[model samples]
Target: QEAEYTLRLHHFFPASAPVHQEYFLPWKEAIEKESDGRLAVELYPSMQLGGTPPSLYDQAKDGQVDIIWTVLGYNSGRFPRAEVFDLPFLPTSGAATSQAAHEYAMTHMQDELEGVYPIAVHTHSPGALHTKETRIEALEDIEGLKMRGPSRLVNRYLAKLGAEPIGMPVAQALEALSRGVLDGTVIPFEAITAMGLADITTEHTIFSGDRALYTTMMIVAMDQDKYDALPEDLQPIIDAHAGGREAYRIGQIMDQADHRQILAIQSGEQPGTITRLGSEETARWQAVGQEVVDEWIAEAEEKGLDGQMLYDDATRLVERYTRAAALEH
Candidate 1:
């Protein structure tokens, strides 16, 4: 008889989300098939197991769930090191950022991620402001716009840029938008399709070149004790789907896509404006962003890390991922 084992995969995203339908489902099927019926991955979405979204990682850390696919940035301020890739305009798309993150993990974050059985450490598409009100042309136009922010870095990023950042789970965003609790939000096109944000808001700050006015992080983790108890050979199947060098390739492919955004913009359900920031305004925005960076530096130092090294490596990896041939002047 096969040594049967069951793993519960929990997350905050709805079961129908693209990440679950397109990415997680396929990945789950493949790993289960490879495990030869010895493993079953049962997914629990929308916090079916209970608790707020931000508590996902801790749930894994404490063995409340066997495995979890959720954002690391949900519990903000605690994950300062992982926020390196989240700085303004750092990544162009999800996949590129995933690749960039994977490359950096090998050298810079190896020690940081060793705490848990990390399967995939990744970043999502940086968010743009989507609203039902006025179009956001300049950075100054963002004043008093209440938007949902998922992480501390993002909240601060939005607040510093003059918007009031209202942090919450994706499930709550649409209701909040409909109820006039939010003026708009900082999110990607998927939120509109996945969470139905476009149903409520008609206008979005279309800055194609904006480095995620804010961004979020995601991770798939396993209960160390549960993972340790599994048969040695079975580990590879999950590992193949989870993290490190090999899984990162998968994460990068699923995580990022300019084409998805391009497709959404093509559909034209709402006003998709790509505001090109002038050098002067961008310079001002960059200065505002620099203060966030400075705060990260201080946080990094507090964590006994080399901020400069991680930044240098992250910059190099992003260049490599984007195939950016020349350094921007």
Candidate 2:
């Protein structure tokens, strides 16, 4: 018998990317297996179906696609509350911060994402500075370099750290870096491998500690009307895989990729020079990062949102999850 419902899942990353291989494939299998052929998912990666990365959220909302997974910051400032995870040094790691993001979104972002049915909201593992020519060892080294920032807040943070920040998606950044349009980009190890940054970039700067320099928020969302149209019996199958824990699992997969990439780089299996910034220099970066956060909070308040409450809750949840993850080890 033909499947009752076949959903099209679209994303910006290529099929070889970790988000597609490690996360989406397993999710597709699980959803298909549990549904027992009643539901199917057909993936269209690399924007194959149509539209640019930023348009993905609206594509799902407008029913142009049944589902989408894209960076929340691609449509920057649209989900203001969810942007907390994008702030510099706010995320501990992919696993903890992704769960923290989901938990925070459950309470704060419904209004912001009212048009789409959010399956999960998560973040990548903390990102590092990947440069093609410059080596960033101190705050001053970041000066005057043209850096690609993944989101609005991060762009601001980049500027605060003295770099000239350019805004673009990771895919575009890859092209830009290759063409010498950018000096460096802030991305996680997984993304570096996924986009083959090892070939284009030669130097990577890592911050020492649990908190990351930055992370980008991501969402796997479905068309609200499509979700509402699901058969009553099949709805629970979708529900089972949607929420904070699932978001954490997705993020854990990203962290696994990050670990693998880092190990490869450390073992000389990948080419690049790694610079671990000293604590003092990291603190300098953090101080400037805080200024970006403060300005964001004031801006959020100007928009009538409880920015402090959002920031406090996001940080509290991240700390709670980070501690729990450590205890598990």
Candidate 3:
């Protein structure tokens, strides 16, 4: 069997990022084999194809690339409905919430997803606060620190907690953290080794339980025409790997990456300290998180959509998936 169609997949991370090495490549192999080699996927990393991370969705919509794996939040207000998941405290587990995100997109967000074949919109396990000098053991410690948040809502979340928020790509955040431009960054543990933050940050602060201070969103999309032009017989091969359980697989991949990256930090010479704030501390942060959630809903209303309705639907899905995931454990 030989490939009749070759899709070039592009993303902003280095090839070593666990999502790339563990998830994307395996997904490529699965689809190729399923198609009996009739569909092939070639990867381009570090935005190697061209344009910035924010431009990736357009690349998919305009046929500049066959596939894209990038964050939806990277494009900011372009995805108000989808950003609901990016809100604080809604997501308990990445695998479950990721599945809910796809479900939400299917019924609620078609207007925003006009072009391109959306594959999956997933998240990482809750991100922690990693800092160079200060240790964020409680809410007050975040005040006045310069922090880089991955997306707009997260930046807003950061500011609501009294930290000065800087918006930048994770790659740039690495430089910012090292050069003293940023005091800390809100990122998942999976990225510590992937982004080399372990060497710079002296302490890692995590919420006590299942709560995450904040999280970001990512998208896996295929060009519309490219998807449409696929051989009729091979479409199912792509579809099978694009959504549903595939979303769960990527979320699991991110969780595994979290473990790997954490080990990478612990095994190193200058191992960073991990601080899990107690119940009292976690409650303090969650209190402020609720305010951010309220503002998010209000902003959604300003855009002429029922933000509260979407939030309710999104929350329903998150709980649905979260319960199912808990059963698996």
Candidate 4:
């Protein structure tokens, strides 16, 4: 049967990456099945459609692509409210935090993302420092290193800690690291294997707590016109796969993939020495992280946005979902 509508979904990750293989592929299948073959979703991985990672949101907004999934941070301050999920030491687990991000966005970020139809806003599991040769044992150890940060606020946080922060998408990190343009990069465990960072990086520095060093916000969105133009009956099918719960499912997939990567690294299937910092030292890092939070609030206030309120709301949502996820176990 011929499809009535064709949706080309674009993303920056390689097709073999978990987000592409596990999340998007299954989502494509479900959308196809639920729509009774009326909606055809074509997956374009590695930005095959065209342009850099930062261009994805506009691509969807401009109708160059029907849908897109990319890191929200890649566009910098364009989605300030959504950047709440990118703050340091705020994320618990991928499943919990991603749900929080989605819920928070639905409430506080619609104005920021006015052009595109948001499907889900999510985060990965907590990210840690992955260095090629240096071992970061304490807060002071990060000084003078050229580090890759995923977003604006995170770059600010890194710079305050004395590392030379270079902002770029994860897609560029592998080449930069190989060429010695970056001494290390911060990312979640899943990316180590997915991006082949495990082969080049020799040390992974993890913090001691339920919270992590940081996490970046990601979004799955559709062209507003494309979504609005969907057949009346088919629109519900798209809605069924959206919202906070659906974002939680995507985060759960990430958590599972992260666990697998952790196991692989631990078993010597991947090359890297895991350095878990103690609570006392982690406390030191958190103290510095608080300063970053304070600065972000001030920056938001300067822009006339209620930064404190947004921070508190995002924190509350994360705590709520974290507790709920704990109960499920």
What C-alpha lDDT do the candidate models reach, one value each? 0.71, 0.88, 0.83, 0.89
lDDT of 1 by residue, 134-211 (tens): 677788788898878777787888888898989887768878888889988777666566676654666666444435
TM-score of each: 0.86, 0.98, 0.95, 0.98
Model 2, 15-66: lDDT tens per residue? 9998798778988999899999888999999999988899999999999999
* Better candidate number, 2 or 3, judged by lDDT: 2
Candidate 2 segments whose C-alpha is farther than 4 A from its true place: none
Model 3 lDDT tens row, 171-289 = 78877877889998988887787776777877888887665676666789899899999878988888887776777778888887777666766677557888889988888878888
Clashing pairs in 2: none
**CA shift of 139, model 4, Å:** 1.4
State which candidate, 1 or 4, has the greater TM-score. 4
C-alpha-based local distance difference test score of model 1: 0.71
Worst 10 residues of 4 by lDDT: 79-88
Best by lDDT: 4
- Candidate 2 lDDT score at position 160: 87
| Deviation in Å, model 1, residue 117 alpha carbon | 1.7
Clashing pairs in 4: none
